Write a protein that binds this ligand. Structure first.
Ligand SMILES: Nc1ncnc2c1ncn2[C@@H]1O[C@H](COP(=O)(O)OP(=O)(O)NP(=O)(O)O)[C@@H](O)[C@H]1O
Ligand SMILES: [Mg+2]
Ligand SMILES: [Zn+2]
Lengths: 638, 262, 576, 417
DNA sequence: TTAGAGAATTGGAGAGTGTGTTTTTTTTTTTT
DNA sequence: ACACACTCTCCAATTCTCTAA
């Protein structure tokens, strides 16, 4: 430790607010590079430099005050570009070994400190001025390299994640990412991103600008971002008072129910009762030791602890939570997003698609391209501008491209067991983008223009005639798994299914019959494929969280369930004890008034069950087990 | 009644929270036993659930000590005693020295041989679980107005004092005037002295007037007296913490204080 | 530059190699180069004195450390356990550079800081102060035996200090703290001492406190670094002291410098001076010990500055105690027995005459003690011990003190128509135990009134908050402590015939008037006074001048005992 | 630890008490005997001795709870505590407190004409006649500057005043009136109501059978004014202790287990009764009163009050009393002005020395011609300086010395004659 | 396409070990 | 003799892999 801490001091010293470099500072930073060139795989030199806080202590003063020496400026920039490179790229993965895990965490800690240190607007200002000078040349390879490393420096600074677990800030407060983003605006560096994105000859930089822009907007979804306006202050104030009111009210109500359930006399007042005629697990009647009031809602299991699960038996879970940034940041982001869509989207997408098609040996990350089209199409649609603003993406090639990518991800998720989690994440991203394409063609039907309506019919015609889009949903439902994907994937999949069936039904109405890739089609025959009992199990799992599901989610799932049960007459497939337990809890909750469709559907299907049970007593056995299609149909025959 | 404890809080519903992931759960409790969770159901990590004392739900209890009354004793014996527990509403309704009738449930409990060991003694201790206990206007204004408007009311009110004393009318008038007093710098209240032989009815007269006024007090100048004229500091027989004992003169502020063998 | 605090706490910063070496060199260079206002090297002298006496302990002053090397003075109270370690390492090699053989005597040297400016009151300590260097004051009440502690073994002792009585508010209670003494600090104090303590404030866990309070609350203690009561004379001090002794009029300078604001009263100042320096104790042939100390009594009219003189003596001397009349008991004067608070056994403890020891014990309103309390001092005043036999204890204690007392005449005013014994009302066994006796009276001369009044008015305008020339009081204090420790007068010869004749004649006349009875004690008293005058002149041997001075003081104080009409004849009888 | 205040305690009940916990900036803001209002929350604290942890073990007619892992096979019990977040009572400071109204008032007082008599009237409106007493007692409030001599001895600041009179007349009124007016003052008597009395005492504490001190009236009256009634009748134990307390302003104790020096810096106003109740107008004060010469010589001023049954005077007194019952400067103006005046420290002028020494010489030769000590010279300086301070004068000019001499001379003459 | 048998890894049910635990004589101050 | 804290072991439950119904 002491060796580096002693030698690194050579760069200079600070006098009040004036920084004085040493006369061999350049040779000194060259020695720091020589240290890094012979660093250990644990990244020990980087941890030592971080402990010595060289970047915060000397490099920021050198860049702010001594940048007139362009060779020294170049040396400092490249040094900190190597130092700031994200930990996942340095180690190659999050390490399995505890020693390397500790080193990774420590390196990432120093990177977090560097990100906080970089928040000074003066650095971005100098960087933007330098970059503004470089682009005026219409240059040497070293000039291009300086542009490259400037872009990569801000990329690396943005890339290292914020520790929301450390910050624990309330909504509308600024995180480290938020403050740094605001500093980008305050420096004017954003204007250069829009120049680079809009200028045609800068296509080589546009691929980097895509990563920069997509890194900035991560915390804000485009729909709520499009929602913002100057009156939001009073809106949030009044709404928060209302939210606090209902929260307090709910706790009061629940308390009183518990208070009435408990007896009034103290916990040692005693007593004992025999439930005459109710036999035990043993040969004789049950003896009950608890208070008299408890028998009003008795179930024998109330005394039991839950079953202890094995470690490897646990399902997947979310590592993320919804947020909103400070109103200043929200307004700035909305302006930037509007200006990017206005000036840059189609040109940048054409450039990025060109690079992804041409430059396959370079292994560029396609997920950013899909993220950007998924984000900006949603923003454009939320603002309901003319479809011309997103013209480039409105073509069949996008559907085929994302289908082959999504099916590749699906096949890899199945085959490449060692990376199935990441393949599932990639597949989920692709599904999200595809849902936006469907929403876009649906929206232009309700436009006033016949030309775009005809274009919509052309796209939808190809999508429904070809096999892949109508087969894909069944392929995903067939291989959904609790370890493989969290429930968010299932929500997206079933909602996309409802939208696909809606547009399919509307398209089938155009002619006496639809012919498809070759066979005469039948909508009811296609829906019969979803009568697989595994699909119903997934639907029931999604239904357990109906109070936490969105209103749109609940509408979509209940609509599809009623259609499948009623019109296909497959009703007996829903006669299940797990479902009946959920129905019992549903009808017991006093909040049932909010869920009229669900309770009426539940009472309807239970009516069918009790009507059958009155005739046939075997239903009480069938209720324990899942049905094959033949059994579902045979139960009505008896 | 002999003695009354300080108020005791008592658990009703324990509140458990996970250290790892802040998930919470509530446990209704069973004749003094708490069913502590072994594992957090949300995050599947054992021995991670903690009892939060001030978030739990509590009740009030008090311990009262009572003695048989002197009338119903066998001759020459010392008296017996029992312990009573009173909950919620009844928890502060009696004070030492007074007398009551009580209805309750006669309970019996085992006791442990030492605080560490789990063995119990073969002879049980019993107590009473209390359920109920009993202790053993314009019309008036108009009557007072008419009576005050009657002649010789001063003589009549004086005559009403101490009917056992047949002739000392002007002394009764002086005592009546002391009870009425002046009104509010200068001392507005009145002080009176009675002198003469011992065995005369003056002590009976003090005890009579003492019983007529709400803020009254009575004691003797002798060192054998029940409460002193002087304030002092002593250790509480229960907690052995200090308590400030003010004297009869302080307690009788805005009241009458009768002193004997002055 | 050492001052460049960046990215690190000061504790971490001084742990680094570069800063540690800079601190080490700076303190070493400070030790070798530090100079006094005269251009003298300070630490050459101090180190040499430390080595010559084998004392292994070096004292540094915070003020001039700051004045010359402020950066170290700035760090020092913030990280004491670091800088004090570096300081010890630096001092030992300077010592070995000057005295290469000193490793034979010791292998470590401790640096001790002094005059630290940031004093705190003993009840104003808070968690803000933890692990920093502080200074406080108080009186010791408990003190363990010296015990060995593991490290090798070193001495260890624990004490308890509390707020000084009369610095707490009236009728309320004092706070207290514990402190730890290690190595050469043990037996730097004993119970009842008032001390100034510099140390590190430190805390640790204790289960008893957590279970007694129910909250996770810690216990605290002070690690002592320097302890001093509230000789070390320089060469310049002894040089000026010895040079002053050349003056033939030094007696006038010393006498005129006692209680300077009191006008007049030459005899009182002279008597108090002799009692302040004192004669020398001796034990010829080992079986016949005799005391050295000179006791004084003052008596006379009210408003004559009697109470004021005692307060001055209390201020100028060291190891002084003051007490008044009915405010003292026989048991409080000598020694007392108690059931010990924690050892649960009978134990004996020191009273005033024992606690004073080789010091001054001042008494006031001596006329108004209870007689059963006043007769407790008879052994201590002559045999100079206190013997006790109570509650199974049988022992004796040292009582080697000087007693000074003030009294009033019977009926409030002295009458020159009566002798001293007739006017004072004290018995012969008390009167004969005082070496010097004085009588002070009112007078009515107008010029003397004008001079006294003008002087007092002058004193008042002089001290608004805003004969020969006397010494500054600090010079006199240095002079007394030198003379009592470095000079021991020898009585190698004197005229026996002259003293014997005078004594016999004097005793014969004392029988005639009966003003005071004269005994063997008077001769021994003159020997003490002669030695005291010899000591004031810093002479090792008594000479003829000293004997004449002693005889003059004796006879001048004796003539005042007589009736006014008799004094003329007595004065002419004892012509000197 | 707190207790129910006197106003709440229901008749016949024993008082209840509670444990209160203070933290951070609120610490040591309340002392025993204070009455305060606390804001916070009520909480429940477990018996920490029976819990166990990886860091530390458990130590070990009711039962607690059972069934926690940390509790083992023991049982756990609770008690109530009140956690308080706030507590309040139930030179530059003058600049901070005085608004322009107060500044204008003290300025108007500084410029006032015959301010001395105006303040006498304002402070003592009830009193009849006896202006000399009013002037004398008023001056005592302004004190005198204390001084420390270079060798470390110190010179007395406070003056002391004594009033002797018949039990029927005014002397008691002055004591109770100034006590009601003044801040930080004590009323007591020579027949004191405690084992300590006027000066400190030793008592054995039964918690250890250990000897400790207990404060007397003159310790509590430190930095204040002390009023002593029936001073002619007093315990000998206190009388000896008063000799030191009057001039040295300290108290010294040396008994078993206790050795201390205690402060008693106080201005004393004493009231006494002459022998046979009524003052013998034919005899001196020294013949009339019980006090000894050493105590009597301590006071800076003396005054005598004696009645006679003049009909008009009696009728006037009666009418004053009944009229009072029938019903210039306020007391707060006097308080604010007095606290302003006591910041001045006037010097004596060179020319004033000649007048002072002359007057003392004149007094001394008069005494010698038909006794006066050095203490009288000090009292001249103190009284004249107090006069200069009360008029807020910059130095002790001769106009103050003349009045101070007049007061002292009239007092001594009526003492002797 | 759905289900059972053979091999490998891992949780926890259970046992063993170490340790802890009113009633008498004498002094001192101040009340009498 | 009767309770905590800690260390350690062996049995068999859960999943991977190959095979038949
Ligand atoms: N010669 C003097 N010079 C200066 N101050 C003096 C002188 N004589 C008396 N005083 C002052 O007189 C005051 C009383 O002094 P003090 O020592 O108590 O005299 P005292 O004779 O002992 N009085 P007392 O104790 O009643 O016999 C003090 O303020 C002295 O400073
Ligand atoms: Mg005196
Ligand atoms: Zn959890």
């Amino acid at each position: 430790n002491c060796e580096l801490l002693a030698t690194c001091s050579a760069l200079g010293y600070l006098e009040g607010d004036t920084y004085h470099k040493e006369p061999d500072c350049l040779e000194s930073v060259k020695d720091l590079i020589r240290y890094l060139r012979h660093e250990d795989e644990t990244r020990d030199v980087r941890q030592q430099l971080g402990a010595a806080q060289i970047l915060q202590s000397d490099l920021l003063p050198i860049l702010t005050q001594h940048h007139q020496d362009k060779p020294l400026f170049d040396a400092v920039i490249r040094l900190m570009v190597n130092l700031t490179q994200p930990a996942l790229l340095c180690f190659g993965n999050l390490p399995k070994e505890p020693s390397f895990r500790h080193h990774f965490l420590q390196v990432l800690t120093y990177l977090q400190a560097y990100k906080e240190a970089f928040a000074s607007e003066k650095a971005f200002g100098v960087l933007s001025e330098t970059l503004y000078e470089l682009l005026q040349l219409g240059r040497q390879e070293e000039d291009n390299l300086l542009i490259e490393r400037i872009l990569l420096l801000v990329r690396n600074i943005l890339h290292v994640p914020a520790d929301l677990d450390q910050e624990k800030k309330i909504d509308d407060d600024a995180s480290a990412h938020d403050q740094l983003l605001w500093a980008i605006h305050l420096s004017g560096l954003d204007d250069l991103l829009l120049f680079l994105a809009s200028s045609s000859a800068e296509e080589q930089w546009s691929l980097h600008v895509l990563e920069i822009v997509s890194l900035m907007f991560r915390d804000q979804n485009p729909e709520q971002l499009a929602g913002v306006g100057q009156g939001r202050l009073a809106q949030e104030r009044s709404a928060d008072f209302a939210e606090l009111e209902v929260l307090r009210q709910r706790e009061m109500a629940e308390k009183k129910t518990r208070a009435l359930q408990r007896g009034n006399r103290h916990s040692r007042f005693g007593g004992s009762y025999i439930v005459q005629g109710l036999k035990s697990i043993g040969e004789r009647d049950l003896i009950f030791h608890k208070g008299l009031h408890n028998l009003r809602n008795y179930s024998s299991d109330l005394g039991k602890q839950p079953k202890k699960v094995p470690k490897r038996r646990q399902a997947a879970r979310e590592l993320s939570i919804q947020r909103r940034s400070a109103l200043n940041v929200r307004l700035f982001l909305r302006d930037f997003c509007s200006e990017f869509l206005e000036n840059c989207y189609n040109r940048l997408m054409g450039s990025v698609k060109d690079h992804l098609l041409r430059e396959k040996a370079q292994q560029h990350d396609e997920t950013y391209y899909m993220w950007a089209l998924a984000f900006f199409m949603a923003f454009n649609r939320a603002a309901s501008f003319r479809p011309g603003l997103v013209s480039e993406t409105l073509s069949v090639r996008t559907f085929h491209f994302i289908e082959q990518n999504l099916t590749n991800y699906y096949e890899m998720m199945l085959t490449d067991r060692k990376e199935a989690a990441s393949w599932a994440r990639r597949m989920h991203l692709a599904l999200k983008a595809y849902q936006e394409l469907l929403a876009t063609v649906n929206e232009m039907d309700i436009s006033p223009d016949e030309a775009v309506r005809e274009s919509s019919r052309i796209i939808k015609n190809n999508i429904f005639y070809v096999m892949e889009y109508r087969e894909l949903f069944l392929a995903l439902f067939r291989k959904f798994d609790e370890r493989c994907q969290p429930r968010s994937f299932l929500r997206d999949l079933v909602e996309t299914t409802h939208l696909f069936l809606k547009m399919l039904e509307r398209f089938c109405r155009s002619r006496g019959n639809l012919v498809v890739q070759e066979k005469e089609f039948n909508f009811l025959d296609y829906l019969k494929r979803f009568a697989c009992s595994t699909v119903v199990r997934a639907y029931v799992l999604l239904l357990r969280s109906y109070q936490q599901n969105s209103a749109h989610t609940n509408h979509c799932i209940v609509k599809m369930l009623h259609r499948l049960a009623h019109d296909l007459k497959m009703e007996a497939l829903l006669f299940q004890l797990s479902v009946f337990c959920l129905f019992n809890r549903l009808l017991s909750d006093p909040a049932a008034g909010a869920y009229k469709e669900l309770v009426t559907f539940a009472k309807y299907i239970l009516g069918k069950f009790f009507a059958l049970a009155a005739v046939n007593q075997k239903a009480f056995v069938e209720l324990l087990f899942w049905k094959n299609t033949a059994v579902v149909r045979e139960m009505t025959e008896g | 009644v002999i003695r009354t404890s300080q108020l005791i809080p008592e658990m009703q519903e324990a509140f458990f929270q996970c250290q790892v992931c802040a998930h919470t759960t509530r446990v209704e409790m069973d004749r003094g036993r708490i069913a502590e969770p072994s594992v957090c159901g949300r995050c599947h990590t054992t021995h991670s659930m903690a009892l939060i004392h001030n978030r739990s739900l509590f009740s009030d209890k008090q311990m009262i000590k009572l003695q048989e009354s002197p009338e119903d004793m066998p001759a020459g014996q010392t008296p017996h005693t029992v312990i009573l527990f009173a909950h919620n509403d009844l928890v502060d309704k009696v004070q030492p020295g007074d007398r009551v009738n009580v209805t309750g449930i006669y309970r019996a409990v085992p006791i442990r041989v030492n605080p560490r060991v789990s063995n119990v003694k073969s002879v049980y201790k019993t107590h009473i679980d209390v359920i109920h206990y009993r202790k053993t206007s314009e019309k008036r204004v108009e009557l007072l107005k008419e009576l005050s408007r009657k002649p010789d009311i001063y003589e009549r009110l004086a005559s009403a004092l101490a009917p056992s004393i047949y002739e000392h009318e002007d002394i009764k008038k002086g005592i009546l005037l002391q009870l009425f007093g002046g009104t509010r710098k200068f001392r507005a209240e009145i002080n009176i002295l009675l002198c003469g032989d011992p065995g005369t009815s003056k002590s009976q007269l003090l005890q009579y007037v003492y019983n007529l006024v709400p803020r009254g007090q009575y004691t003797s100048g002798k060192g054998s007296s029940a409460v002193g004229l002087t304030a002092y500091v002593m250790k509480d027989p229960e907690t052995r913490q200090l308590v400030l004992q003010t004297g009869a003169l302080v307690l009788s502020d805005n009241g009458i204080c009768c002193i004997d063998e002055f | 530059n050492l001052e460049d605090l960046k990215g690190h706490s000061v504790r971490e910063w001084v742990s680094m190699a570069g800063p540690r070496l800079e601190i080490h060199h700076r303190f070493k260079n400070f030790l070798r180069t530090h100079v006094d206002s005269h251009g003298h090297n300070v630490f050459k002298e101090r180190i040499s004195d430390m080595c010559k006496e084998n004392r292994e302990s070096l004292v540094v002053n915070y003020e001039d450390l700051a004045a010359r090397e402020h950066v170290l003075a700035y760090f020092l109270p913030e990280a004491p356990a670091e800088l004090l370690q570096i300081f010890d390492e630096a001092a030992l090699e300077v010592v070995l550079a000057m005295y290469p053989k000193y490793d034979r005597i010791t292998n470590h040297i401790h640096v001790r800081i002094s005059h630290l400016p940031l004093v705190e009151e003993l009840r104003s300590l808070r968690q803000l102060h933890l692990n920093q260097l502080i200074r406080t004051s108080g009186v010791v009440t408990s003190c363990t035996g010296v015990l060995p502690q593991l490290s090798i073994y070193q001495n260890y002792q624990r004490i308890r200090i509390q707020e000084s009585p009369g610095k707490v508010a009236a009728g309320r209670l004092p706070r207290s703290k514990d402190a730890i003494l290690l190595a050469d600090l043990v037996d730097s104090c004993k119970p009842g001492d008032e001390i100034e303590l510099t140390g590190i404030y430190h805390n640790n866990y204790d289960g008893s406190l957590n279970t007694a309070n129910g909250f996770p609350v810690f216990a605290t203690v002070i690690l002592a670094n320097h302890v001093a009561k509230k000789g070390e004379l320089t060469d310049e001090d002894v040089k000026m002291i010895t040079s002053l002794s050349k003056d033939q009029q030094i007696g006038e300078k010393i006498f005129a410098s006692i209680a300077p604001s009191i006008y007049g009263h030459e005899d009182i100042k002279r008597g108090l001076a002799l009692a302040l320096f004192g004669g020398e104790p001796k034990n010829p042939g080992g079986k016949h010990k005799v005391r050295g100390d000179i006791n004084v009594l003052l008596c006379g009219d009210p408003g004559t500055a009697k109470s004021q003189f005692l307060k001055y003596i209390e201020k100028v001397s060291s190891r002084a105690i003051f007490t008044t009349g009915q405010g003292a008991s026989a048991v409080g004067l000598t020694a007392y027995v108690q059931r010990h608070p924690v050892s649960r056994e009978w134990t004996l403890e020191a009273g005033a005459l024992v606690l004073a020891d080789r010091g001054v014990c001042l008494i006031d309103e001596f006329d108004k003690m209870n007689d059963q309390d006043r007769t407790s001092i008879h052994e201590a005043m002559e045999q100079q011990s206190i013997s006790i036999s109570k509650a199974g204890i049988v022992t004796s204690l040292q009582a080697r003190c000087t007693v000074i007392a003030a009294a009033n005449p019977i009926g409030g005013r002295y009458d020159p128509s009566l002798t001293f014994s007739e006017n004072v009302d004290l018995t012969e066994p008390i009167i004969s135990r005082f070496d010097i006796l004085c009588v002070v009276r009112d007078t009515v001369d107008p010029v003397q009134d004008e001079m006294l009044a003008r002087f007092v008015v002058g004193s008042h305008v002089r001290h608004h908050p805003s004969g020969v020339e006397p010494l500054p009081q600090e010079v006199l204090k240095k002079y007394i402590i030198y003379a009592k420790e470095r000079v021991h007068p020898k009585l190698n010869q004197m005229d026996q015939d002259k003293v014997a004749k005078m004594y016999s004649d004097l005793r014969k006349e004392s029988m005639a008037t009966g003003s005071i009875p004269i005994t063997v004690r008077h001769i021994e008293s003159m020997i003490r006074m002669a030695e005291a005058h010899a000591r004031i002149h810093l002479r090792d041997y008594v000479i003829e001048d000293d004997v004449n001075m002693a005889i003059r003081v004796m006879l001048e104080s004796f003539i005042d005992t007589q009736k006014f009409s008799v004094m003329r004849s007595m004065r002419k009888t004892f012509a000197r | 630890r707190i207790q129910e205040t006197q106003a709440e305690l229901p008749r016949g009940s024993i008082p209840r008490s509670l444990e209160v916990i203070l933290r951070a900036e609120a610490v040591e803001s309340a002392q025993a005997g204070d009455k305060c209002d606390f804001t916070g929350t009520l909480i429940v604290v477990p018996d920490v001795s029976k819990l166990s942890t990886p860091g530390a073990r458990a130590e070990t007619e009711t039962e607690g709870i059972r069934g926690l892992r940390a509790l083992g096979v023991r049982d756990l019990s609770y008690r109530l505590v009140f956690l308080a977040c706030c507590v309040a009572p139930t030179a530059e400071s003058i600049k901070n407190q005085m608004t322009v109204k107060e500044w204008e008032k003290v300025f108007e007082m500084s410029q006032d004409k015959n301010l001395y008599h105006n303040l006498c009237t304002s402070l003592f409106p009830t009193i009849h006649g006896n202006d000399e007493v009013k002037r004398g007692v008023l001056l005592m409030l302004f004190g005198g500057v204390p001084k420390t001599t270079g060798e470390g001895t110190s010179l007395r600041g406070d003056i002391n005043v004594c009033i002797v009179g018949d039990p029927s007349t005014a002397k008691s009124q002055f004591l109770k009136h100034v006590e009601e007016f003044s801040p930080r003052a004590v009323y007591t008597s020579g027949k004191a109501s405690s084992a300590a009395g006027l000066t400190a005492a030793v008592v054995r504490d039964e918690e250890s059978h250990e000897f400790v001190i207990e404060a007397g009236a003159l310790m509590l009256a430190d930095n204040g004014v002390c009023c002593i009634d029936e001073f002619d009748k007093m315990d000998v134990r206190d009388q000896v202790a008063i000799h030191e307390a009057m001039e040295q302003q300290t108290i010294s104790i040396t008994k078993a287990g206790v050795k201390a020096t205690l402060n008693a810096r106080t201005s004393i106003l004493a009231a006494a009764n002459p022998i046979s109740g009524h003052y013998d107008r034919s005899k001196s004060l020294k013949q009339n009163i019980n006090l000894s010469a050493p105590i009597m010589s301590r006071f800076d001023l003396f005054f005598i009050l004696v009645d006679e049954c003049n009909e008009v005077t009696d009728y006037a007194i009666a009418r004053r009393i009944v009229d009072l019952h029938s019903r210039v400067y306020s007391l707060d103006d006097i308080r604010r002005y007095l606290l302003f005046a006591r910041q001045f420290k006037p010097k004596i002028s060179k020319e004033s020395e000649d007048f002072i020494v002359e007057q003392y010489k004149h007094l001394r030769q008069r005494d010698g011609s038909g006794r006066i000590t050095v203490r009288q010279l000090e009292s001249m300086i103190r009284l004249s300086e107090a006069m200069a301070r009360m008029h807020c004068c910059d130095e002790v000019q001769p106009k103050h010395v003349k009045e101070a001499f007049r007061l002292l001379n009239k007092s001594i003459i009526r003492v002797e004659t």
